[PDB]
Amino acid sequence: ERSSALSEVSLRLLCHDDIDTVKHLCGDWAPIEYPDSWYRDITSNKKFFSLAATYRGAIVGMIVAEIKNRTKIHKEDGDILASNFSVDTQVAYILSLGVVKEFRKHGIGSLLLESLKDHISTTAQDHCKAIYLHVLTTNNTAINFYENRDFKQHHYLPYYYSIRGVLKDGFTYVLYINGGHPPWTILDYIQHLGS
Amino acid sequence: ERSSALSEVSLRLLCHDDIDTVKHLCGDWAPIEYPDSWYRDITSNKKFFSLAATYRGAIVGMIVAEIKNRTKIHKEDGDILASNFSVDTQVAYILSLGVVKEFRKHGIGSLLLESLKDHISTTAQDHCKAIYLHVLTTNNTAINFYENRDFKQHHYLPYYYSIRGVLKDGFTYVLYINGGHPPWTILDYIQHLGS
Ligand SMILES: CC(C)(COP(=O)(O)OP(=O)(O)OC[C@H]1O[C@@H](n2cnc3c(N)ncnc32)[C@H](O)[C@@H]1OP(=O)(O)O)[C@@H](O)C(=O)NCCC(=O)NCCS
Ligand SMILES: CC(C)(COP(=O)(O)OP(=O)(O)OC[C@H]1O[C@@H](n2cnc3c(N)ncnc32)[C@H](O)[C@@H]1OP(=O)(O)O)[C@@H](O)C(=O)NCCC(=O)NCCS
């Protein structure tokens, strides 16, 4: 019944009319409260690649990502790429990837991820050197899914408490593409040169 | 009546019994929701310098700060101190400074700040090289107070949106002490050497 689901799946861009659905879906995935303006931006702004997967015409999954130059990476994650990659270097940040619970394990998430990769390849060619994202420490399912897909856990991000707000702890996961890699230690060089 | 307030002010450490009061006061200053554990930590943990100002025995202001090694600074603020200051270098982060609205402009805030400076001087001597804090962009009163007190606006901190949570925008303000300074550009060196 459901298991036929991929056969009935289509892909389309998110749009403004989807905002209520997106809030509901995002809300199911995590408890965070994004502002209305955020939802408006991801749905409508071309700067983001926002792609929905629909089952029988209804959204059951989405991926939202931004392709950006390396200088746009937040300092917490500044060390994902080695210094020898130029400021012109690009990365893709996955703001959100999610699939409705009933529809998981049907390949929808994989399809969304692959579509992003295809988009990057077309759009940025070899210039984009990494895809990175944040996951909550608690998301076993997500972590397993990314790890199986060659993402590496770059580092732990601690709880953040400030007058500005509060952040839960998390991990940064990175998939390197087109020769991208993290900064190398003396030992890393020693091995490459040494052998 | 109120104007006599400083004459009736005393200073004491925060303690566990203060948690409800602290929540109420902090809540008045800003809308952020810290967890109970945070309040428990600032009130009870010696790692923090948490000092209250009381008027007629009731808390009307507080300062909470942590003296820490430079490696403990978050990456967003990693560039507050120049690289030539050693990893052994210390800084103080002001988690909170606040005074009840009725009691403002009586010198309580200044007193709290000064007490922190005295504490740093006693505790860390010349080893601590900066005091830094975060302010919301909207806090005109706070900004004026710090600026008048020789704090400098180091940089803007943008809104942060992620699965981990949401942060409002802000500024990092820094007061340099004991010869501390930010990283120097080529031009900075050119001037020092040049003239
Ligand atoms: C991570 C996540 C997106 C995975 O999506 P999916 O579940 O749509 O992903 P897929 O179905 O492609 O892959 C999941 C597993 O099902 C397996 N699978 C694929 N097709 C299958 C099928 N037809 N029958 C049985 N299993 C199948 C896949 O092999 C994969 O297993 P593997 O990792 O061992 O290879 C999903 O777990 C999720 O939405 N988690 C929550 C993420 C979140 O919190 N997002 C917040 C954003 S606001
Ligand atoms: C910033 C803040 C702490 C200042 O405290 P105060 O108001 O207790 O500080 P002071 O009274 O020492 O100084 C304020 C002004 O009053 C002046 N003042 C001092 N004594 C005065 C007096 N007796 N009569 C009139 N003015 C006086 C001071 O000169 C100072 O002016 P200046 O900056 O021009 O020198 C207060 O504005 C505040 O609590 N803001 C909110 C901060 C916040 O949001 N914190 C969140 C933490 S969770």
Numbering used by the authors:
A (entry chain A), B (entry chain A): 5 to 199
In the authors' words:
As the first N-terminal acetyltransferase discovered on an organelle, NatF, encoded by NAA60 and also named as Histone acetyltransferase type B protein 4 (HAT4), Naa60 or N-acetyltransferase 15 (NAT15), is the youngest member of the NAT family. As an N-terminal acetyltransferase, NatF can specifically catalyze acetylation of the N-terminal α-amine of most transmembrane proteins and has substrate preference towards proteins with Met-Lys-, Met-Val-, Met-Ala- and Met-Met-N-termini, thus partially overlapping substrate selectivity with NatC and NatE18. Another important feature of NatF is that this protein is anchored on the Golgi apparatus through its C-terminal membrane-integrating region and takes part in the maintaining of Golgi integrity. The structure of hNaa60 protein contains a central domain exhibiting a classic GCN5-related N-acetyltransferase (GNAT) folding, along with the extended N- and C-terminal regions.
